[PDB]
Amino acid sequence: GSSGSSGKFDESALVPEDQFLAQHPGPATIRVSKPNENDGQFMEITVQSLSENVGSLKEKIAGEIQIPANKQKLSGKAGFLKDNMSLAHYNVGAGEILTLSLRERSGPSSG
């Protein structure tokens, strides 16, 4: 049993995927940076639930950029997010931002 509020992000006291999940019942808008950009503008990819697997997300964007989850790589605060892992586990929800990197920059494809 436990309960309380939070403010600053602590490394030696991160919220468990179990708590992070409930903490946010509704959908959490996950912001993702553009492939080979930053100053430009980010996209808006929300997920009904956080429990979802990082992979399921890569698919959503994979449509806009037209790139297979395999090609594009997702990186999170902690590091390269694994499709097998979930979002809540990494503490991603209405606050955390993920980055999208393109596998081997094309060249003739500018913004």
From Swiss-Prot:
Record's protein name: Probable splicing factor 3A subunit 1
Protein localization: Nucleus
Assembly, per entry: Component of splicing factor SF3A which is composed of three subunits.
Organism of provenance: Arabidopsis thaliana (Mouse-ear cress)
Residue span, Ubiquitin-like domain: 32-105
Shown chain mapped onto the complete sequence: 683 to 780 of 785
Signal peptide start-end: none
Domains as described in the record: SURP motif 2 mediates direct binding to SF3A3.
